[PDB]
Structure formats: structure tokens, C-alpha cells
Ligand SMILES: NC(=[NH2+])c1ccc2[nH]c(-c3cccc(-c4ccccc4)c3[O-])nc2c1
């Protein structure tokens with residue numbers, strides 16, 4: 001997260017860190033046994049880390065659970081990143097409390113101008129690599145479809161939306177992929193891609209979760 005602030009320990013209880021010996025992507029807990037992340041974060045040997053704040057120190061509240069299976073959307077396209085969503089089933093259910101809690105899936109899509117909270121342990125520099133130890137947060141609005149398409153002509157599908165600031169300075173970045181974009185208490189987006197980080201007129205692009213709710217429900221119900 002570039003230009004964001006320190007969230008504060010366990011203030012984003014649905015945030016998870018996907019770990020394979022280091023933090024490589026974020027995710028969102030949607031129930032005690034399932035996490036939603038981005039398809040491009042897929043790899044084998046994923047350990048899901050819940051209740052984290054400093055990812056390099058065991059401070060208490062952490063729950064480390066191995067993924068039992070990861071389900072990348074069948075129509076995921078790695079070249080366009082269309083359908084960049086994945087579900088991860090946990091080997092055992094997580095213990096939910098005030099520090100570890102799930103986030104609700106939306107019933108309707110959000111409108112441009114909606115303010116959302118984006119969080120993660122990704123890079124904090126637009127020009128360089130600085131990864132934080134604790135969780136960073138950023139409040140950002142969803143942009144209109146015309147501004148998004150004007151920024152990335154020919155690259156936005158109906159399963160994506162832009163959120164951020166066109167002036168640059170505040171944005172999600174590498175390491176934040178797969179994490180949550182929460183608006184009014186509902187998970188509306190998944191950090192997916194962008195051109196660099198926090199560059200002027202190049203906002204972040206997110207997977208539009210409202211388009212996948214029946215898919216998520218049906219997939220969880222059959223696995
Ligand atoms: N400007 C942005 N809002 C933005 C958002 C997510 C990004 N994710 C990345 C990204 C860059 C290089 C590699 C990965 C990557 C690839 C495979 C697995 C995990 C991360 C990224 O997600 N850049 C990103 C830029």
C-alpha cells in the first residue's frame with residue numbers, strides 16, 4: 001500500500017496473509033473454512049495466516065492453517081487477468097472471535113464514489129521496494145467506468161473496476177494482490193493489477209466481486 005497508514009493491530013480481522021515461507025499475497029476470510037483471493041496468487045504449498053499484524057513476529061492471535069485446496073476460476077485468463085479470483089478451502093476451520101472474523105459478500109455492486117478500505121502488506125514505495133512488517137490501510141473511492149476505461153483503454157472487462165486517485169501517491173501495490181476492498185462492510189473487490197503503483201492517471205484495478213457471488217456460493221456448496 002503506497003500512501004496509506006498503519007491499520008492498527010487486528011482492526012481488519014478478515015485480512016489473511018498467504019504464506020509459502022514469506023508473504024506473497026493477501027486474501028479475505030468469508031467464512032470459517034474459506035478464503036477468497038486472486039487467481040494469479042495461486043501456487044501450491046500455501047499456508048493461510050489469520051490474525052496477523054506484524055507478519056515477521058508471533059505476537060499472539062495468529063492462526064496458521066494449511067490450505068486443503070485452491071480453486072482458481074475456470075475462466076481465469078492470465079494474459080488479461082479477467083476472472084482473477086480464487087477460493088481457498090482451509091484444512092480445518094479457523095476459530096472466529098473479535099480478532100479473526102469473516103467479511104460479508106455483497107448483495108449488489110457498489111457505485112462510483114463509494115469509499116472503500118483496501119489493506120495489505122505489499123510494497124509501500126512506487127519507485128523501489130519497501131515491504132512493511134505491519135498491516136497498512138488506504139481509504140479509496142471506486143472510480144466511474146469512463147475514467148477507468150479512459151485510463152486503461154481496451155483492458156477493462158465487466159469483471160473489473162478501478163479505485164484510487166488519479167493524481168497518484170496512494171494505491172495498492174505488489175504484495176497486496178488478492179486482498180480485500182471493503183465498502184460499507186461488504187467485500188466488493190480483490191486487489192488485482194495496475195500499471196506500476198501510485199502513478200498519475202493509472203489507478204488500481206480490482207476484481208468485481210458482486211459478479212461472482214453465485215459462483216462462490218455454488219462452488220463452496222459443492223466442495
Ligand atoms: N497499482 C496497483 N494498484 C497494483 C495492484 C496490485 C498489483 N499486483 C502487482 C503485482 C506485480 C508483480 C507481481 C505480482 C504477483 C504475481 C504472482 C503472484 C503474486 C504476485 C503482482 O500481484 N502489481 C500490482 C499493482
Ligand SMILES: [Ca+2]
Pocket residue numbers: 052053054055056057058059060062
Ligand atoms: Ca505476527
Ligand SMILES: [Cl-]
Pocket residue numbers: 149153154155
Ligand atoms: Cl475500451
